[PDB]
Amino acid sequence: ATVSLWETVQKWREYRRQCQRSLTEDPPPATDLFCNRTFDEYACWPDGEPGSFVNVSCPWYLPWASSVPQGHVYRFCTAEGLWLQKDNSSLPWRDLSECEESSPEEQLLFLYIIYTVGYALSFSALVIASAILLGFRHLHCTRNYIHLNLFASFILRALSVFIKDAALKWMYSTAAQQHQWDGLLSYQDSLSCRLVFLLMQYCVAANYYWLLVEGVYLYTLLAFSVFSEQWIFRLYVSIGWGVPLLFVVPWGIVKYLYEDEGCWTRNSNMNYWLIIRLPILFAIGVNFLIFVRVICIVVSKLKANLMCKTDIKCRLAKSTLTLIPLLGTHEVIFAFVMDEHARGTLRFIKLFTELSFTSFQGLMVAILYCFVNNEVQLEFRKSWERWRLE
Numbered sequence: 351a352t353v354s355l356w357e358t359v360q361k362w363r364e365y366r367r368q369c370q371r372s373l374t375e376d377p378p379p380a381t382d383l384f385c386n387r388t389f390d391e392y393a394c395w396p397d398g399e400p401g402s403f404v405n406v407s408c409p410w411y412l413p414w415a416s417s418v419p420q421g422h423v424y425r426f427c428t429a430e431g432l433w434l435q436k437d438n439s440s441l442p443w444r445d446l447s448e449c450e451e452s453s454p455e456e457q458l459l460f461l462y463i464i465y466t467v468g469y470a471l472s473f474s475a476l477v478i479a480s481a482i483l484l485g486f487r488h489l490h491c492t493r494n495y496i497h498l499n500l501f502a503s504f505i506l507r508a509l510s511v512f513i514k515d516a517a518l519k520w521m522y523s524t525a526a527q528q529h530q531w532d533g534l535l536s537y538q539d540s541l542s543c544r545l546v547f548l549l550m551q552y553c554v555a556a557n558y559y560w561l562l563v564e565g566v567y568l569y570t571l572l573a574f575s576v577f578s579e580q581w582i583f584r585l586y587v588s589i590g591w592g593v594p595l596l597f598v599v600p601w602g603i604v605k606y607l608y609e610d611e612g613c614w615t616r617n618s619n620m621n622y623w624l625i626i627r628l629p630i631l632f633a634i635g636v637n638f639l640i641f642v643r644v645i646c647i648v649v650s651k652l653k654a655n656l657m658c659k660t661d662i663k664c665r666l667a668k669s670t671l672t673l674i675p676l677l678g679t680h681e682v683i684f685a686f687v688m689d690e691h692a693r694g695t696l697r698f699i700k701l702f703t704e705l706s707f708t709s710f711q712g713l714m715v716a717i718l719y720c721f722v723n724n725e726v727q728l729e730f731r732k733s734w735e736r737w738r739l740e
């Protein structure tokens with residue numbers, strides 16, 4: 351098992367709840383001058399009769415609570431009925447030496463750096479490429495409208511991750527103490543957190559459905575008779591941008607109705623997460639079938655012509671390498687490797703490694719379909735000649 355500050359704070363909440371109930375349920379002692387019973391962030395202490403110490407068990411929410419189940423934090427209140435103050439009139443004296451004491455926090459922090467750098471390169475390249483394809487009016491096709499909508503989905507996905515990471519400053523808090531935990535929990539069960547999470551989910555799903563729109567349009571070019579060019583464009587834009595909403599708002603409704611705490615992370619017993627994960631896998635699988643059929647087409651067209659025994663393979667390899675980025679073919683591997691029953695730190699480590707590799711899909715697409723594209727080079731030359739004549 352892997353544990354981090356995540357699981358420690360999540361157990362702290364349950365400890366606090368039980369402690370609050372006990373404090374609110376414990377009858378007061380019959381005697382007087384008793385030392386008042388309070389919950390400090392570190393531990394919960396009961397009432398103590400004056401002139402004696404308190405023998406409390408080591409709190410179970412600590413990661414090292416199982417190493418020594420024999421320690422006892424000690425706090426003393428004098429015979430007058432007040433806790434013993436320590437030096438410089440500070441928090442009352444307590445004995446913490448009984449039970450006290452690379453990591454998952456470090457791993458997650460490095461993956462975040464690689465994924466942020468990749469998304470930031472992808473964002474910049476896709477903005478340049480959208481400028482280039484929208485600018486020139488000779489490059490106005492239907493396939494270039496599909497490409498612009500795909501670029502838009504990539505850019506929205508990158509922009510959503512930055513907001514989620516910047517709104518909850520987890521990287522700075524990776525070493526927070528007990529006091530800092532209260533705040534962390536307060537933001538998690540707020541409404542800003544839940545709606546920022548919902549926005550990120552929508553942007554992920556919309557990107558996936560624009561790599562299926564790409565695939566379905568190429569397939570219909572290679573296997574179908576020409577049909578109305580507006581009745582197909584409206585249908586494609588509708589599928590790309592508004593089919594995600596048919597399973598992202600039902601998920602956001604069930605989560606909002608049937609949950610009190612948390613920022614809508616994966617529930618404990620029930621599995622609501624299938625409302626999002628299941629259509630994503632459907633799109634990924636259909637787009638894999640499209641990939642295989644298109645490559646079969648290229649192989650027959652390549653065998654029919656006259657080439658060597660090796661030039662066939664060279665051109666086939668180059669074409670397959672150039673088509674993995676457009677249809678997102680690697681997501682079939684990355685969905686095979688991912689464990690769908692992991693929760694907490696393990697889930698975050700797995701997710702971040704996939705994001706670390708797949709953050710640079712937008713950069714690959716931008717280079718392959720806008721910077722080395724032959725027509726784009728052609729307009730750069732033609733535009734340059736008109737200025738050089740002047």
Ligand SMILES: N#Cc1ccc(COc2cccc(C3CCN(Cc4nc5ccc(C(=O)O)cc5n4C[C@@H]4CCO4)CC3)n2)c(F)c1
Nearest residue numbers: 354355356359519520523524534535538547613615616698
């Ligand atoms: N309580 C609390 C708490 C505890 C510790 C710390 C600081 O230390 C640690 C330690 C381990 C991991 C982390 C961060 C690692 C991840 N981020 C934020 C975050 N990105 C997510 C992406 C996808 C999903 C998903 O399920 O698909 C869910 C995602 N989540 C967690 C929830 C979801 C909204 O936020 C949250 C923390 N930070 C703290 F900042 C808060």
